[PDB]
Design a protein around this ligand. Structure first.
Ligand SMILES: Nc1nc2c(ncn2[C@@H]2O[C@H](COP(=O)(O)OP(=O)(O)OP(=O)(O)O)[C@@H](O)[C@H]2O)c(=O)[nH]1
Ligand SMILES: Nc1nc2c(ncn2[C@@H]2O[C@H](COP(=O)(O)OP(=O)(O)OP(=O)(O)O)[C@@H](O)[C@H]2O)c(=O)[nH]1
Ligand SMILES: Nc1nc2c(ncn2[C@@H]2O[C@H](COP(=O)(O)OP(=O)(O)OP(=O)(O)O)[C@@H](O)[C@H]2O)c(=O)[nH]1
Lengths: 103, 423, 423, 103, 423, 103
């Protein structure tokens, strides 16, 4: 489980080798808590293939506005320093996979 | 996940290709003028089957795995005019002369000159595939580029790559030297194509006039019908989902072709409702399935029900309101069909609707009445060749008189194959 | 579209035939006393399968493809009295004597005299068919006409026409010389009939008394049960529709008969609800299917579940309220049945209901417990033949003592066939 | 497309060789217009097997009453000078065929 | 109706056995502390498959067809403490020493001493069966009793009874001498078991921690997962009904095992919802089926989707809200699975839900990724055997050094079998 | 069809060899009349395997209370002098069989 700050985003996400999934979230977001246990399973089954990161938008208000986030939870797939795909809202552990499989 | 390359040859081929790619872009949410998607979003579906990604996600692009070949430049110029930065400019290959409706020009003359460039683009597309599952060749066979160079390239394709499935989608002329070019092309389509799906311009014309009320149908109208059918056949390869039955070109042709000597197919589509009403007027499943299997719905001027089915695939996509009803209906059709050679009856389902119908179906059949379409052609060829109408056109171009007899006989060997399958 | 001719022999045969044709007329909207339809209207369904048209539509008529043969004239006289101008008068053939319950009279005596006329009517009916798909012979085998002449005519039919499917529907006597005639008829039904469906009078009697509360059941009551089953089996051949699974006599027997030596069938019907309540009281699908496969529902005094199924067809018709439920149920039955010789499990569906039930089912099975019914018969035959009860009846009539031993042995060869199929 | 009058009915319909389908209809009949495009398809697919005729009951009031027509549209199948079958009301192009197939 | 005997060996085996029998009692309405039912009532379902009746209905009892064997007495003592008068006291066999985690003690030492008593109880149970359909052996193979005596008894079972199907359900250790005992047991499970279903403790641990939030999972937690799967697999044998697809152990293994050399199975369960919410939170069919086929749901630390399926059974039980949806889903899975050796895809349905889920599914698969689990084991064995870690433990106990090489090679022959099946 | 009294219960039911099904019933019970024709079919199909008996609780009030009957109709399966199984309420001829098959 990788926690991020605004200061660490550059190195952790953008300068990163290999694919990375970022969960922009908050404590006061019902649906965000819903997928917290789901995201842990993917951190196992996509070992080496993916790294899973989290950014809490309350304590780090600087990053989300840069990416045009419309709400939370927002899953962002990064490859180099680039957004590959986007998932908005809480979802099944199965729809998440089909999303990861194709990109 | 399988990759497909679509090669389009000549006027008809490329005009259909352009319409097909625009529709496929729209299905996948890819901008059809730029190959881009909205900021941050990926295309829907299994986009990599028909597209490759260029560069980063910011300034990058999704590029049709497409090559377009012509001799006359008008049509490819038009593609450039209407399609922004969608295509790889290196994949749009043309020259200067048309083939003047002469098969021999495309096969032996100016066609041989274009081949190394076209083949080199095939190389590049092939190698940049994770797993190549097939090549679709889009062409008309009444002219001289699609027919001649289409013939040349399929032959070439099979010699160099061998194992790759090659499907021809071939447009047939409607009742000039068209009967000659059709017959010459048919030989290669018989011997070298893994399968050939016909689109009979005569049927398309009628459907557009009849079902749609178009007094003077244009090629744009006819291409709508073809495009829907192509989108629908390729949907099994371009989407995934909980209920989506994924089917490769390999698996499809395997089920549709019982022997290498019987690989000519026909297709029907439903609904054939006029675009005018498309989303406002819907058919229920009953009328839809009924229509699909109706003689008036096939993209061939003939009647599949008066012949025999060697094989069949029903490719459904979109909303399924009532699956017990659809299964009951298809089971009933399955027991109603005139049969031969043991049959297959395959059913595919794709969740994703096309862009114009909430639900639609394509019927592909290997049926013996294709002999009728082919017979119509040969009767016209014989009518001209009996008196050597434009014979010098082809004689002065490298073909010998006896070798065109061989090709008339070759096509006859194919027409007798389907007549034997019936009785 | 297939044509069927129904030949009925003797009392039971013809009384059942009359009830069958009246019901079929009513199903097709054909006036059962005149062969006519209302002004301007055609019959429902595929009427030409069992009817031919006579003349113009104004004064014309729809004529059962039927021939009725008897020696005693009472029963055919009664048909003439109750059936207006429905039948072709030339197809109702009788004489003067009864066969006095003597198989040998029907096979060798007075029966041989009627044969050229009966065969000539068969000729005429056959030739006036577009495509003859089968002949159904309706008869009881406990008397001397149905048994003797039934035997004679099936033999004759097969020698002259060969390839035409011939199905016997044979009524068996309930525990006089009946056991003798049954056994003699069985030989021909074993060797010459393509298949034989039994109707065990013992079971019919019980069902009518038990399920219907008839203290003293008559033959009319028993014929109701047979007629429903016959209507139901023939519905696949007499109707078409979007969901209607059309099935020929050929296709049916092919699926029901795994070897020529095992072609005896039994049937069950549901609902067996009393006619008293028929439309007011309905069974749901559950209870209906459950009942269909119950030992108490078969038209044979025996228990199919204690034996083994060689083959099975479930022929459904009418309303289908819940197709997922019915499929789930039939699949479950399919995995529950005691099996042998590889099995078949065929399902037919006809949209058109019969005239008395909103939905109904017929179960046809090739099951080894038919051996029990047959055993019951042979035990009675042996009980009389051990002491030569009415032996002179048959001896003075042309049969030899040793040749009836051959027929007792012939039937034993059939009873051992089904016992071997079980273990 | 064969148009009829009361005067032409005899020759065109009754003295006709081969089977013929007559559509009794009107302009003010909703359902009649519904099947006009349908009837054209059958005129193609049943070439030689059938001829398709139309009679407009307003401008030719004499014929329908002779045949006991209860309303429109009414399809009448004729063989010689005789009504083979009858279809009342607008219908699918498929139910029309099953009707034509059987008679 | 088929009878099953369940033999449990060692700690894990017996603790799982106790949990299984308690659950099965509850499913059948049998008092799990006394073997009784309420006054006048019989158990639900086909209780005689897994239970026999003792005496009159008043003071009588329903007795698990069960035998429990251990060397150490703690676990069987605990069973006696928690299970009232459920078991036959004569079927709970123990001694005094544990096998100290030594396979050789169980196979050659103290194990040989217990065998005549255990075999004699098998005799008695077998003979008191109307029709014995299989024996299930419940055991862990990381210790010395389950592994050693488990190996001894399966071998013994097959020599004496031959034709009776024997299924092993074997628990595998999670990454001491466990790798040694596993490998030694595997030989017998390869050569003598008709089939072996693995339960990988590593996967069970993860699921309990992951899906259920248990920081420190206990063996009780792991046994819940196993018990559900065992209840679910045995439901086809323990219930009947209008829609219930009855399936014997024989029929099941026949469909799951394409060759005797490929008889190792894995299983998945759904829903894996935490017991905490079990009846308050339900999955729909979609999510349920989706989950069933997910890599994170299998009771094996590996990914079935990255390998190939040789065979498959989906065993559904409980409420069916939407059968067209479930059939559509399973059909889609059937066309999505990586395949080899021709495949089977069997679907079972049982009406009766288990005690904790309104509907549940077990997936049994013969899949080539079992090679991964097995590989993990062999790498650990080799890591110790390369340096002869606890080798004297086994050498001083009757095994010879070269003969354990044979067993390491034997297991390698099984791991190569599944690797060959993949490519 | 075997009718019972309180006096005959002992010999007819309890001292009986082989299995026996007892229908406790009344005339004023709707559901009891419902299964009267059903019980006759089982008396045929289970010949030797079962004997079917009836006890009318109005004219024989002594027996039902001994067996803890909660209402009517109640089917009781006896083997020796012991209640094997119990069915309360009117039922299908098919559910009755599955009940008889298992016990
Ligand atoms: N359905 C359809 N048919 C077309 C279309 N364009 C041309 N055709 C038909 O195709 C046949 C002529 O083939 P073309 O493709 O135009 O000829 P070509 O090989 O491309 O070019 P040349 O050899 O230079 O003449 C004729 O039968 C036309 O009616 C089209 O866009 N759609
Ligand atoms: N189910 C049924 N059985 C009948 C019917 N009529 C007669 N039977 C039975 O058929 C057997 C007698 O055969 P019949 O058909 O009456 O004799 P037959 O061949 O027609 O006439 P004869 O040879 O002159 O005696 C007996 O078992 C009767 O119980 C009937 O209408 N329905
Ligand atoms: N899933 C599960 N695993 C268990 C359980 N009990 C023990 N194990 C595992 O089983 C393996 C040890 O095997 P045991 O059955 O305990 O040993 P044994 O043959 O019974 O007894 P000894 O030979 O005397 O040691 C280890 O991998 C344990 O983690 C249990 O209740 N459930």
């Amino acid at each position: 489980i990788i926690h991020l700050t605004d200061d660490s985003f550059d190195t952790d996400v953008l300068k990163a080798d290999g694919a990375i999934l970022v969960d922009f979230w908050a404590e006061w977001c019902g649906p965000c808590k819903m997928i917290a246990p789901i995201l842990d399973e993917i951190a196992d089954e996509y070992q080496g293939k993916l790294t899973v990161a989290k950014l809490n938008i309350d304590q780090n208000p600087g990053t989300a506005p840069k990416y045009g986030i419309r709400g939370i939870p927002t899953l962002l797939l990064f490859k180099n320093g680039e957004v590959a795909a986007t998932k908005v809202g809480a979802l099944s552990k199965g729809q998440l996979k089909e999303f990861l499989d194709a990109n | 996940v399988n990759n497909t390359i679509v090669v389009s040859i000549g006027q008809a081929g490329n005009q259909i290709a352009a319409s097909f790619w625009k529709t496929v872009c729209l299905e996948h949410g890819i901008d059809p003028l730029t190959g881009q998607t909205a900021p941050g979003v990926a295309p829907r579906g299994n986009w990599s089957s028909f597209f490759s990604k260029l560069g980063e996600s910011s300034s990058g692009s999704y590029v049709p795995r497409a090559i377009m070949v012509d001799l006359e430049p008008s049509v490819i110029d038009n593609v450039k005019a209407t399609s922004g930065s969608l295509f790889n400019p290196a994949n749009l290959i043309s020259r200067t002369e048309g083939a003047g409706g002469n098969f021999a020009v495309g096969y032996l003359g100016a066609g041989r000159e274009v081949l190394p460039e076209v083949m080199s683009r095939l190389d590049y597309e092939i190698d940049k595939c994770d797993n190549v599952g097939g090549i679709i060749v889009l062409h008309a066979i009444g002219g001289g580029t699609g027919s001649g160079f289409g013939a040349l390239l399929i032959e070439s394709l099979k010699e160099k790559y061998g194992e790759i499935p090659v499907l021809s989608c071939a447009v047939l002329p409607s009742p000039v030297t068209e009967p000659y070019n059709t017959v010459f092309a048919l030989n290669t389509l018989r011997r070298s194509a893994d399968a050939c799906l016909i689109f009979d311009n005569e049927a398309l014309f009628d459907l557009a006039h009849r079902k749609w009320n178009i007094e003077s149908p244009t090629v744009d109208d006819l291409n709508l019908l073809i495009t829907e059918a192509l989108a629908g056949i390729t949907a099994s390869m371009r989407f995934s989902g909980f209920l989506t039955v994924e089917i490769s070109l390999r698996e499809l042709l395997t089920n549709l072709v019982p022997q290498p000597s019987l690989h000519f197919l026909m297709c029907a589509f439903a609904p054939l409702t006029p675009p005018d009403r498309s989303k406002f007027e819907e058919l229920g499943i009953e009328e839809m399935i009924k229509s699909l299997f109706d003689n008036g719905s096939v993209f061939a001027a003939c009647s599949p029900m008066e012949g025999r089915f060697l094989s069949t695939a029903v490719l459904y996509r979109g909303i399924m309101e009532d699956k017990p009803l659809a299964d009951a209906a298809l089971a009933a059709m399955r027991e109603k069909l005139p049969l031969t050679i043991p049959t297959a009856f395959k059913i595919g389902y794709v969740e994703q609707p096309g862009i114009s119908h909430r639900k639609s179906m394509v019927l592909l059949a290997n049926n013996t009445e294709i002999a009728r379409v082919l017979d119509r052609i040969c009767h016209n060829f014989d009518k001209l060749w009996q008196r050597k109408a434009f014979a010098n056109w082809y004689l002065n171009e490298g073909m010998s008189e006896e070798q065109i007899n061989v090709l008339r006989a070759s096509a006859q060997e194919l027409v007798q194959s389907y007549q034997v399958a019936e009785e």
